[PDB]
Structures are given as C-alpha cells and as structure tokens.
Amino acid sequence: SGVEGAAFQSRLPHDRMTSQEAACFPDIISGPQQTQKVFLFIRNRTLQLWLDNPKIQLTFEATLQQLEAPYNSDTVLVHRVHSYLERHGLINFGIYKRIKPLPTKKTGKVIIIGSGVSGLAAARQLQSFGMDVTLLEARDRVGGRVATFRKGNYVADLGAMVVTGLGGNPMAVVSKQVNMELAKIKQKCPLYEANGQAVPKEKDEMVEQEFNRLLEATSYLSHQLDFNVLNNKPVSLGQALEVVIQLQEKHVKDEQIEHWKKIVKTQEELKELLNKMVNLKEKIKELHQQYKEDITAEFLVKSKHRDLTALCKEYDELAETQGKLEEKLQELEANPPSDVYLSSRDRQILDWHFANLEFANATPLSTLSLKHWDQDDDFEFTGSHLTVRNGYSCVPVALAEGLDIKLNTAVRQVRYTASGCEVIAVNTRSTSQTFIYKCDAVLCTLPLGVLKQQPPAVQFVPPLPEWKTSAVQRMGFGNLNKVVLCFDRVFWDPSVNLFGHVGSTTASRGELFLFWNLYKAPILLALVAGEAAGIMENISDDVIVGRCLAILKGIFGSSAVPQPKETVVSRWRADPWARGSYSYVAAGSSGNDYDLMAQPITPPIPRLFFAGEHTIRNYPATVHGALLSGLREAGRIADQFLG
Template identity: 60%
Template structure:
C-alpha cells in the first residue's frame, strides 16, 4: 500500500510550531486513544540512553516475608476470583541516584514470583506442559502448585548465595504443603532445571555429580556460554568451553589501567525488578550504581540547549514515534509497493507530511485573509450603494413634503391627495429604515471581519515545521534511538522494531562500579575453559558432534574436540559470516553439514548492529560531576550519531563518548588520533579551550571489525520479525547419517546468545536467560523432563 494514498491520522497532520522564536507551547495533543501520552517516554529500549524515570505501573505490591498461605485451600471454601495486584511506587522522597537498587526488590511470595519473571497466580505454558495432572485436577490443585512454587522461589530469592537443596526446601516448607513431598520434589526439579533457582555463583551444599551423562562443547565464553556451562556441569554433564579470545566475557569487556575503569561493551543493567543480573550481583557482591536521569544537551556550537526547547522537541519525537505505530498497527501501512517500510522511512515520511501540512496551513491562511478582505471590500461597496440609495430616498421624501403643501381645488380631491401623499411618505420612511438597518448590519459584519483580519495578521502560522536547529535536536533523539538499536533507523522494521517492549524490566538502571567484566570472570570458577582457541568447523551428525579448532597463541595444528552435542553461542555477526563464506577464511566458522535453510534464512533476515565508544581518561574532572550524561547535538543528519552522548559513570575522571548510526561504521575506518582529536574539539566547544586537558589514556572500539563479534548486538531489521529470534534459538537435528540415510535422532546443535531470545534481545540479561534456557532444553532432551527425572543425578 502506498502511504500517500491513505488518510492520515490527526496526530500526523497536527501542526506544531517549533521555530526558534516560538512561545514554547505545543499544539493540542491528538495522540491516538490507544497510545501513551507523548510526554511519557515509552517503555522501550530507548531507556538505555537518556535514562527514564522509574515506572512501577506493573509492579506488584510488596507483601510480608511470612509465607502467604491461601486459607481457602485448607478450609475447602469456594475459591474467589484472584484480585489484581495493586501498584506500589518506590520511595519518591529520595533522589533516584541515592537509592540502593536492591532495596527495590520485592519480597514475599508475590515478589518472589515477580522477581523470577513468573505470574504469581497463574501457571505458565511450560509449567502446564510439565504438570498436566495439576491443570487437569482443577483450581485447588493449581493453587497448591502455585503456593509451593512461589514459596520455593521465595526461599531462593532470600538467600541466592547458598544452594537450595530439596532437603532444605522440605524442612522450610510450611503446612500443609510438606505433606506432598513428591509434588514439592517435582516443582523443585522443574525450577532448578529451568534456571529459576540454583543458578549463578553460590555455595554448593552437595558436590557435583561424578557420573557424567555426556560430553558438551560450549562455543564462546560470553555470558550465555558461561552460565549454560555452569548449569550443565551441575546437571552432570562433562563441559568444555572454547573461546577464541584471550579473555572471557565476549562483548562484556572492561578497560582497566591504573585507577581508570570503563566498559568497552555492555555497560548498563536495564532495570532490577525481574532481572537475573540482580541475583548474580548479590551473589558476588557487585556494587551497582544507579544512573541519574538528567541529560543536558549542548548544541553544535557548544551552547546549552534550553530545557523547554529540549523537552518540547522530545515530545514531538515521541509523537512521531507514536504516529509510526499508528501507521503500522492501526492503519496497517507497512509496505510501499512490494517493499517493507523501515522505521526511518516512516519517520521521514511523517516529517514531510508535517512540512506539507505547514505549507497547507500557510496557503489556507493567505486564502482566509484574501477572502476576508474581499468580503470587507464588498461590504464597503454595498454601504456606499445603500448610502446613495438613502440620498435618493431623502430627495423623494422632500418632494413629498413639498407636494403636500399644495392644496387641490376640491375638498374631495384634497382628502384623496393627502391620503396618497401620506401613504407614499410612510412607504418612503419604511424603505429608509430598512436600508438603514441593512447598512448597520453590514457595518457589524465589517467590524467582525476587521477583527478577524487583525487576529489573523497578529497570529500568522509558522512558515516551517522545524527550524535547522530544531531538526538538529530532533536528530539527536534519532541518534539516541539508533544507539538503542545499534543501527541507522532505515534498517529497522517499522512493524517489529520494538516487539520486545512489553518485557522491559523496571526499576533503577545501574552500572557496575568496577566494570561489568567482573561478572563473567566470576562465572568462570570451576569451568574447563580453553582460551585462544578459535573454532574453525562444527561437525554434527546423528550420534555426536566434533569441533575443529586452532590455537591462536601457539599456532599449533588443529585440535578436534569430540562431544555428544554442541552449544553454539557465536554472535549473530559471526554466524552471518559463517553462512556467507563458501571457502575457509581466517576467523570464519563452517558448519558441516551446512545449517538448514530455515536457520540460514533467519540469520540473514535478523539484523546485527554496530555501536562504538571512545574512552577518554583525564587527570582531573572538568565537567559537572553530578551529571551522569550530557549530549552533544550534531550539525547534520548524517553525522547525528557522532559523539552524540557522553557518559560520566566512573569514580575516576573518565568520559565515555558514544558513536551510533552511520557514524559508527564510518569511524571504524578513521585513525584513533583523528577520533580522539574530534572528541577533544567537541569538549572544548562545550567547556572552553582552557578547561579541557589532553587525555592521559584513550581507547577507541571497533566492534564491527572485531572478528569474534562482527558487531554489537541484534535488532529487528526490515523484513524480519520477532519470530526470527525463535528460529535462531531452535536446535538443529541431523537429518542424514554419514552414508546419506535419513535419521530421526535428537538435536546435536544448540544455540544461545542475545540474538536467540525473543523477549530480551540485545541485552546481557537476555544472553544469560538464553544460556539458562538452553541448559534446561539440553537436559530435557538427554535426561528427560524434570517431573519424571530425579532431582539429583546419581553419582
């Protein structure tokens, strides 16, 4: 459908004057009824950049730590309908930056379920599949299941530093639920299998199983590979982790030198409620620092953008985004001809529509003035005509008066003549009065027209939709969005780019005080990890798998690792190179046999973006230490992502500049000296030449050029959808044996990583959850479902 052929919603055509001399007042809000207010930032991945104020609309009310046992179960009363949980906002009396993020964690059964991303009063689909007898037996059985499940979750949330064994669970389980040990055992096994309890770094009360169920090779020592390896090891598998780099963490990398600390990759923990990173941080004692939301903007010339101007254009930015959603989801405009539309296409189309609407209002304004002037002139001409008519009536009236003085010769004639003259005189007076009233009415109309003309002349419409400076500020917000998605807006699917918004965690956004890399380093404890080991080929067949590697440090001949199955956590960027290469190249991976067509198609459709950082370490702080973020507005649309945002989140004098959008790709071909020089020039434009010293240390990232990353994180590209994440997550089962005979065996190749989790893509917690998911999936395939498999593997 051609968007120009459809009716445009009122929000799109509503004119908003944003020129420099505007009175800072937006026009009437015409947001569609099903959208949020434009003043409110949407719950989307934009929150990674200009951090939003906390929202708690969906946060359950905190309950007491004492188990909340449902009395209706023990008394056999009729079960009432579950009441909707009320919201409880965090304490607003404390500044956001001073809050302890862990104090926001909810307690009680309801809080434990919420923190575990599970509904408190409802079974999930996976739970219903594993416990069909519970759903079959009705509401009372479901209530019993939920109380046991939530109580076990509560035990784990209260003390995630110690293994929650089945024995301790039974000891702490309250009446009457301890009377059904089999159900408690099954629920405990289910929660442990799927990574809801006993995950991360904790004190084990039971040793690891000595009898191994099989050999697993995990490719990649990022957060997903490490957490999956730990889980599989605890379930009784022999696990080896292969990592091409000389370090663990993947795209979690921290720069440390002297007192300087900065994250080169993942940096922000986006929300604490429901986030598994919260549990890990409590386990290893990571200090989390909440991010202050204030973000002043500095124009291209270094001048501070007025807060009113920034907020006004940000509202317009959100209105434009809401309009794209209206176009896509309400009007179903997602194609132009046979080509799917991108978010960038839709935004530019809406901007052009607004500009067109401004011109239309200008034309209407001139037309209104012309019409009013023509009506005023016509009224004046009518008055002149009627005044002339009054003069004629006056003359006729004078003649009648004179004729009445002449006396006829006969009495009868006199009476007749007088009557006729009186009739003519009265008729003339009536005509006079009628015309006079018409003149007065025209005068009133003319007065009204003059007032309207004066009002029009005093309130001319804007001659532009956005001034050049306004467009620069709007482009900053676009760059902000390009950072959130690691790609130019023209690459994002109009319909599906924000498909994960409903699963955004809430609560404080935080950073890790000593660098994010301390988390993956902690996860390495007890694991067999082979660093400097690059995977060259992944072979999988009906009865096992082989991984051919090369040692990058010693350049030894290839080493082959045999396994029952392989868990591949290679980045989407590396997978894209793998399926595009037909011959062996350095730093590329081959699959043998090639991945199935459906898997390759999903890899090709889904996007893998790029975001780069510039780390600047100084000997002193010359910026406002109370501000975590400040923005730099670019001078052109093409360069809007160049050094558009600076972060001050370190305890030492370190600034971190972001490069997003088209600029992220351009800077990879520019030398460090040029990039750092540009940074210093921008900072001097803001703070003054004398205030900005030369940095002591600098680091420039180039994630696209990194052979083990090939980019930063995934996004839903044009032509892709959220279902492609599911396809990337799906395991691969060999279809033929070595002789080409068809087989029907179990999967041998599994996939994890942020690009494989539909609800939490492009995040560290998403990668972690994908590792937990795959560990559970592997166990389900090779050990059986947890409700039929004993809690502890036999040793």
C-alpha cells in the same frame, strides 16, 4: 506478597501455571485445581527461598525443611517442583556456594563455543548438573561483548554497561552474587547544539514531545491501519517516520494556506468597501454644493437637509462596518499559524532523539522492522535502568570460576553426526597447531555477526539447514561504538550522568551524540550510533578523539578541557569475534526468527544447540537475555543427555 513477589521476580504469573509447567506436570494441570493451588505455592515458595539468599545452593532437603505444613508432608511433589526449577535455571543459577559438592563422575561431554555470558551461564549449569564441559574461546579473555577497560583506578565498559531495571531481571540475582555496584541513571540529560550552546528547557521538552508523538503515530499506522508493506517491500520504522513527518508538514502548509485566504478575503472586502465610501463621499460633495438655492427654501433647505444627513446615516455607518474589518484583519495578521512544522534547528534536535533510538537498537532506523522492532516491549522489567560503577566485566569473570576455559582457541569447524560431535579449533597464537575436541553435544554461542560472516568463519558439517541459514540472513545485526576518554581532572558537571551533543546533519546524527559520566575516575564515554558507527571505525583513534575534544571544548570552553591521559575506542564491526554489537529485528524479519535461532539441529537426536542474545525472542540484544538463553539451553541439553 512474598511468594507472589518471588514469582514476579522470576518472570512467572504467581496464580497460574505456565505452558512449560503444564507440559512437565500434566497430571497437575489436568487434575484437581486444588492441587494446582498447592503446586503454585510450592513453586512460588521455593523461588522465594532461593531469591532471599542467592549466594547459597538451595537443596531439595533444605526446601522441604523450610516449607510449612501441610506442604512439608508432600515430599514427592516438592521434589518434583525443586528438580524442575533447578533444571531450568530458576533456582541455583549464577554463582553460589555449594553445600552439596559436585560428584567426581562426570556424565556426558559438551563443548561450548564462546565464553561470553550465555556460554558461561550454560557452562556453570551443565557443570553443576554433573556433565563434562569445556569452553573454547577465541579471545584472550572471557566475557565476549561484556568488555571492561581497567588500568590503575580507571574503569570503563566498551561493551554492555547498562542494567535494565531489576524487577524480574535475573541480573538482580547475579548482581548480589558477585557484589557488583549499580548506580541508577539520573534522568537529566542536557542537550547542546553544534555551536556548544545548551538547548532551553522549553524546546527540549517540546521536541521530545513531538518525537514521542511521531513514534506513537508509526505504531498506530502499523498496528491499526496495517501499513506494513509497500511495493512488496516491508516498511521500516525510518520509512514510516519520514512519512509521518511529511504529513505534519502538509498539515502545517494547509493551515497556512487557509489563513492567507482569510487575509486576502478580508483585504478584498475592505478595498471594495473603501471604494463605495469614496463614491458616497463624491455623492455627498454633490450636495455640500448645489444645496443652497429658493424662497420655498423653508421647505427646500429642510429637504436638502434631511437628505444630506441621511447620506451620513449611510456613510459613517460604513466606517463602522469598516472598523469591524480593520479589526478582524489586524487580528489575523497578528495571529498567524505555524510557518513550519520544524525549524532547521528543531529538526536537528529531533534527529538527536532519532540517534538516541538508533543507539538503543544499534542500527539506523531505516533498517528496523516497522511492525516488529519493539516486538519484545511487553517483556520489559520494572524499575530504573542502572549503570555498572565497577565495570560489567565483574560478572563474566566471576561466572568463569572453576570452569575449564580454553582461551586463544578459535573454532573453525563443527562436525555433528548421528553418533557424536567433533569441534576443530586452531591456536590464535599459532594458527599452525589445531585441536580436535570430541563430545556428545555442541553448544554454539557464536554471535549472529559471526554466523552471518561470508565467507563463513566457522564451517558446519553437515552445513546448517536452509531454515536456519535463512533466519540468520533475515535477522539484523547492529553496530554501536564507544570512545573512552580518561582525564586527570573533572571539568564536567558531576551531578549529571549524561549529556547530548546535537549534530548538524541527519546523516551524521549518531556521531558522538551522547556522553556518559559513570565512573570513580575522571572518565567520559562518548557514543557513536547509527550510520556513524560503522563509518567511524575507519577513523584512527587520534582523529576520533580530537573530534571529541572539539565537541567538549565547544560545550565547556577550551582551556577547560585538558588532553586525555588515556583513551580507548571500540570497533565492534571490525572485531572478528563479534562483527557488530547486537541483533535487531530487521524489516522483513520478525520475532519468530529468534525462535528459529534457538532450535537445535539434529540429524537421529539433538546434537547441535544454540544460545546467545540472538536466540531469545523475549529478551534479545541484552546481557540478561544472553544469560537466560544459556540457562535455557543447559536445561534442554540435560533433558536430552541426563534425562
């Protein structure tokens, strides 16, 4: 299944047309189904040709010459399919050698705001389409939220660092194009408690099992019993989790109650039984006395005998139905149900798993939409997640090649009229001098964090619509930070990619809870997630680093941990060019807000466009999502201005 694989790698069903293809090829969709079969084959085959060699441009001509008969005879259809694929960035995207050098005459002018992955991806596309494009970037470097620290042989990512599975991932293509080294993340992640001692394999698995069950329960509660609203307020994942925990505690307490009652019932039956036995002893004494007096005794002794014995066919008979209780009793007082749902130490380990979830969503669980937080799960790529051994920055740096990028240029105003656009920016090195760039269209890749800024960092004239600002307000924008510790010696286990630090309290569960071992040099990356992320930004590097070494010394022993030669600490929330790490579906929002974020603003025809991780519903908060949003917008714009 080569062509079938190509469709999959392109996130398309290999045996049916998509709604997009239906719209652009209505004559094929509403026509002979045999022609559709031909369409899909041409499409899947063209993708395969591109994917088999993503370093060279795939021309219409080369596609035609490589298609087998009878396909290579339907010249017009092939061109229609090749043009569509190229326009929408499914082929000839990223970085590749052009065999068809760009035309000197550039049509249309578009200003891209932001030189991150989405802006860069869109820039390259628009340029290859022959448009005049200039990127305005506030920072003194490209990449935005993909940021790599490089000094000597030290390499460490302060922004994105993980690639999520290559099957269907556009980054699989870009990876090949820029020669970026990826390493699969080894699963083993040992956990250490606050005292530094390792958590036994048993408990680790037990608690992780509960975590999974707890999450599965919130999903049931949400997508079955429709428990998504309470007191007119939307329910958060954090909220639901604490409720499911309470129920577990209730159940445990109920089984404890029932058990104690079995004990008390058995204890009462015994006491009462012992009491009638004591009276039967007193009744037997009444006989082992009296019984022995006269001459008719040959009949009086017989009588007193078959009488005193019958009272033993009664007594030791009770001692029998007594041993069946002392047995039942001791059996119960030896097999008590769980005393608690989670021991104090168990709850701390569970909180480590919640912190891990707060890391992934870049936000405290109490802010996540119970119903939509995993809204995009159905789009995950297949395969092991990987890490970028040589620094993720190699991607935006390569994507910037040949582009007209203006660094240290912060945009402050965006004007858009029915007949043109004006973008006003200022030199960040001398806020005195401003710049005024005229253009036909503006592509805004500003982070959701900057769009939410109050007072606004950049002004829109006219101001953005209410349906856009409302969506910007509902959507969540998280935070996550890292501390880079550069040593001259490796004191950790080189075979382990990650290990966790279990915090003491629920509130600080995200503080330096996870350490990563990913590079050539002796470097460790520690994460600060959830509530701890924003708070820790208020601590100086020295103090935060010291707390790290304290954790590390507790695990590997002091004297084993030398002072770091180099350290880097990120503060994404305080970073004015980001104001956070990435978006998350907030309680009260939904995946639709991502679609609303993608919508262009048009007074008589589309003028203001949007790209970025926050504008792509099926791939939010990721580098590939940023990439795809950029490819998407370049297509929408070329369609408007080039036809």
